Design a binder for this molecule. Sequence first.
Ligand SMILES: [Mg+2]
Ligand SMILES: [Mg+2]
Ligand SMILES: [Mg+2]
Ligand SMILES: [Mg+2]
Ligand SMILES: [Mg+2]
Ligand SMILES: [Mg+2]
Ligand SMILES: [Mg+2]
Ligand SMILES: [Mg+2]
Ligand SMILES: [Mg+2]
Ligand SMILES: [Mg+2]
Ligand SMILES: [Mg+2]
Ligand SMILES: [Mg+2]
Ligand SMILES: [Mg+2]
Ligand SMILES: [Mg+2]
Ligand SMILES: [Mg+2]
Ligand SMILES: [Mg+2]
Ligand SMILES: [Mg+2]
Ligand SMILES: [Mg+2]
Ligand SMILES: [Mg+2]
Ligand SMILES: [Mg+2]
Ligand SMILES: [Mg+2]
Ligand SMILES: [Mg+2]
Ligand SMILES: [Mg+2]
Ligand SMILES: [Mg+2]
Ligand SMILES: [Mg+2]
Ligand SMILES: [Mg+2]
Ligand SMILES: [Mg+2]
Ligand SMILES: [Mg+2]
Ligand SMILES: [Mg+2]
Ligand SMILES: [Mg+2]
Ligand SMILES: [Mg+2]
Ligand SMILES: [Mg+2]
Ligand SMILES: [Mg+2]
Ligand SMILES: [Mg+2]
Lengths: 61, 385, 136
Amino acid sequence: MRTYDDTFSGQRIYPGKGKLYVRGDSKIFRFQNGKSESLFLQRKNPRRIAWTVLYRRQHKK
Amino acid sequence: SHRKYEAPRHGSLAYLPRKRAARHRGKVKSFPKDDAKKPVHLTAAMGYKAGMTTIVRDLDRPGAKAHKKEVVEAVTIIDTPPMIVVGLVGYIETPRGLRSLTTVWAEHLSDEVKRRFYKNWYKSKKKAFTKYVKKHSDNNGAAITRELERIKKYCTVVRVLAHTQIRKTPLKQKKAHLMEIQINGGSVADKVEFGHGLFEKPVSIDSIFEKDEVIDVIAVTKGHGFTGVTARWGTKKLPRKTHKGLRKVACIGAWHPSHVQWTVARAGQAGYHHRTSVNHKIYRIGKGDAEDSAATEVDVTKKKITPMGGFVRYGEINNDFVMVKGSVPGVKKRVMTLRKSMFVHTSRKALEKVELKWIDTSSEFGHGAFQTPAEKKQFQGTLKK
Amino acid sequence: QSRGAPGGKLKMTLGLPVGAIMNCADNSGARNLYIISVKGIGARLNRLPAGGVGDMVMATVKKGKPELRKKVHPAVIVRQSKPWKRFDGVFLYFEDNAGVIVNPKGEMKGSAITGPVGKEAAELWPRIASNSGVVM
RNA sequence: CACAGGGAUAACUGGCUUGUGGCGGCCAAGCGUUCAUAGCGACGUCGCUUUUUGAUCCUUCGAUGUCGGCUCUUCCUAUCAUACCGAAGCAGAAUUCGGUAAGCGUUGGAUUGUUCACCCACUAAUAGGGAACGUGAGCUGGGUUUAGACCGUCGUGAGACAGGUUAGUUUUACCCUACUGAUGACCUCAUCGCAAUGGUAAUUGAGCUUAGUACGAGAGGAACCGCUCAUUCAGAUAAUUGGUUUUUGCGGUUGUCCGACCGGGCAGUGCCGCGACGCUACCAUCUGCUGGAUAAUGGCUGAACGCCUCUAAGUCAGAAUCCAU
RNA sequence: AUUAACGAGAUUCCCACUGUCCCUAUCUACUAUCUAGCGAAACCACAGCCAAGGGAACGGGCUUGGCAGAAUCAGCGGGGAA
RNA sequence: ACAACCAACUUAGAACUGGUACGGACAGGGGGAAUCUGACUGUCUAAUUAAAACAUAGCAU
RNA sequence: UGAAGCCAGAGGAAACUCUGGUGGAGGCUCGCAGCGGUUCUGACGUGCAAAUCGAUCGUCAAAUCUGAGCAUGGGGGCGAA
Ligand SMILES: [Mg+2]
Ligand SMILES: [Mg+2]
Ligand SMILES: [Mg+2]
Ligand SMILES: [Mg+2]
Ligand SMILES: [Mg+2]
Ligand SMILES: [Mg+2]
Ligand SMILES: [Mg+2]
Ligand SMILES: [Mg+2]
Ligand SMILES: [Mg+2]
Ligand SMILES: [Mg+2]
Ligand SMILES: [Mg+2]
Ligand SMILES: [Mg+2]
Ligand SMILES: [Mg+2]
Ligand SMILES: [Mg+2]
Ligand SMILES: [Mg+2]
Ligand SMILES: [Mg+2]
Ligand SMILES: [Mg+2]
Ligand SMILES: [Mg+2]
Ligand SMILES: [Mg+2]
Ligand SMILES: [Mg+2]
Ligand SMILES: [Mg+2]
Ligand SMILES: [Mg+2]
Ligand SMILES: [Mg+2]
Ligand SMILES: [Mg+2]
Ligand SMILES: [Mg+2]
Ligand SMILES: [Mg+2]
Ligand SMILES: [Mg+2]
Ligand SMILES: [Mg+2]
Ligand SMILES: [Mg+2]
Ligand SMILES: [Mg+2]
Ligand SMILES: [Mg+2]
Ligand SMILES: [Mg+2]
Ligand SMILES: [Mg+2]
Ligand SMILES: [Mg+2]
């Protein structure tokens, strides 16, 4: 047992919840919910999404 | 073959008639076989469905693929405030079945019991059991003593009249659900003294059931109203070209017999049926006073079983609870009957001794990611509040 | 001897009925796998046979070397886009559906697998696990 | 194309019959390494069924909607598979014949309107039938089965063709019963119970071990117990995932309109992304017990019939069978 | 006999696409539904529970059995050879 | 090959910009390889058949 | 979309051939109204209607559509049949 981090938004992923996506390039992505999964599949940039962990780190918040 | 390609029948003939149950509280149709060697003990209890949640535990099943790995599985939480015992019923065995010989009521019945005997309690005079309490008082309660002697001498099956404490649950109802629980155990004399001593004394779910016990849960399922054939029986939907409706059975019978038969699927009532779901393993019997009901030996967070924001459409849990594996019939807030198993268990799965590892307490009102308000504040830092 | 079924496979979401086309994830020369049937399927009216990761199927090659075109080969599914969960409670899915041409005994016809391989495929078939790279 | 009629008379069901179709017996010439009867059984011969087609014309001509397919229920046994057994030209494995037994199953496709057939593939198995050749106020209309049209043969011609093509309106339930659910008067109201009767539900396979062991000269090659799963079916549930969006919840955006761009109206929900609750999917999760009486069969004691032998009196075990929980 | 272009003509295949289908689920509007008002028609020997028998050879009535308890509402499409 | 005063549309080029979205609603061809048949446009069985049927130009008597 | 006719340039010994414009022909083409009526064998089918309604569809500069006046009258008329 362990917790993971959403690769798009940095949210904590407790066991059972969320989804795991294996890109054909052998990459591994973890999503806490469908909101982050949809944005990832729409090839949005996590750094331009204002509620993500990466955005708050770039903008010093 | 005259049925060109044949398939198994849609639905079960063993659950007819599929009509609204004649009751709202699940009924124990049969009690266990009552071995006379075991000590006296109750065999049933009543609780209220609070909701579902998920857990993680280390499986233990030699030969299985996940023999020592962690498995995620759903559980159901049943709120069980302690029950009060207010009566004693004796049954005699007759060539026509079992017959209730006499009933003994303890004095000082609470208003929760007394409301069960009225439809308009608000404007009544509340005269229930007002002249009965004189039996306990007059002649040093000789009338009650005679009835107790009758039960010991004649009756072969003894049951207590149970009582819920719905005032301790977050439900708007004030009527308590009354029940008969059979005292399986020793001799008839032992059963009467066991039941008599339990008068007006609360009985906790701790004594009736253990942690690793396999139980049966009895409740009335979720109502769906008048529903069609495809929903009730799961028949194949008709092609989209059909003129007068698609969700129907095409042939409802042959020419002969010249009748519509009882084995043909027809639209009507679905749900709200009485069901007895069996072989449910208990995972935890939590305490209502403990502040760490959801805390395990691995997750040492002092968190209670109530998810963040409370159980959806139920509320919080401030009483004892039973954590049972899997799903059970009924809806939230529904009174549910827990009964001891009538079978003998020899499977390793049934005999397995469970030990929890983590209990989810994230909100069920959404995609909750935090298990406690403290964890939410450290992750999110400070807000404008 | 015996029939080509994964004898020990746990239940999983299938998401690949017959008539589906998988990418060929090995160097056998094929580029498609047309699923014509699944091994171990029972019998129920109108229900199409379906398989998931690690299930052996019979397939035909719609695109590839002419030596593999007009024949029926036993294949094994190693990827699928339909999400499925293991006993650990996590829901996993890949980018596309893929499979590898094998023989009746289970040995792979090719020698190298392109892309990730689902865990169930590796456990059930020793030769797929040997020739696979990243497995998750 | 029309009228008066006909069930005095055909085409579809039903009724009698069973040649024909199908199925089952008796005898024993032969086949089977020798050996009629393990398995077959010619020449003969006795039957049964009404799932084939005939024969007939009893009912219907002031009409019983006339093929098939889809859907759904139930019944039969002449048992394909599964349970338990007997026999073999049964060493093992595989297979063949037979007994109880219809409890439970008997598939996905290419071609054809097809029944049928023939292949591919899976499967424990892909058994055979009935219910007005079950089922058109259940569907469809592919065929058949009006009127249009084409071709070939036939006819001088109009026209004919179980010869071939293409296009061709499928009506009504609100009545009674039947079924599915839902109320309900009389015996004061209410709570807690009993249980007559009715229904009843489970199914099958694969891995590990047994074990490369028993068996067998090699090749080959089991099963009982015990676990672990999965197929079909059944009941339930909404923690997770997936679906659904009038939460018209928030955000984005197009064209107009409100006079200064905030906030809104309209485009029958303008469109797009996310979307909680609720509902919901072997697209998700959980669960599905055990007595007793037997059938075939193998036995015990034991006469009839001083010997014997499962039966005659008595009696034991025993099937997915019957009854009950 | 062959034909470019054309065809709400008939036929076969391939790509894309999709609830046709595996296997169904959910949402909206208007009905159905309940109420106030208004208010028909087809049809109708008499009526309306079965099993078997016989009978003009497929009965609601006959015979022998099974049985059988007021009054009703919403659906339904087996029967009334409707 | 100039200077001054007017004019309303069309086209082209470049920075910047945005959750890479932009014919953002509306409006708005699915395509290909063939076979049979009629050349094509046109016409008819109002109220079950729009067709390969009729017609047509051309040819012939 | 772009036929005749017309303008300019280029190539060639010549015959003549190319390129860019202009022009606006066709029982041409996409498509709105009108006209029609292919499919859903959709709705309705004691209907709104003794033939209508919805989507989809055919044609859309002409062998297109159409009003009024007039002619043809029953073994007769009229008929792209
Ligand atoms: Mg049939
Ligand atoms: Mg229709
Ligand atoms: Mg005849
Ligand atoms: Mg015969
Ligand atoms: Mg006749
Ligand atoms: Mg006659
Ligand atoms: Mg007639
Ligand atoms: Mg008649
Ligand atoms: Mg009829
Ligand atoms: Mg038999
Ligand atoms: Mg017949
Ligand atoms: Mg009918
Ligand atoms: Mg015709
Ligand atoms: Mg001739
Ligand atoms: Mg004829
Ligand atoms: Mg019973
Ligand atoms: Mg369900
Ligand atoms: Mg969701
Ligand atoms: Mg949801
Ligand atoms: Mg003896
Ligand atoms: Mg009768
Ligand atoms: Mg009658
Ligand atoms: Mg009489
Ligand atoms: Mg009578
Ligand atoms: Mg009827
Ligand atoms: Mg109806
Ligand atoms: Mg017409
Ligand atoms: Mg027409
Ligand atoms: Mg012509
Ligand atoms: Mg138009
Ligand atoms: Mg129309
Ligand atoms: Mg229609
Ligand atoms: Mg109607
Ligand atoms: Mg004019």
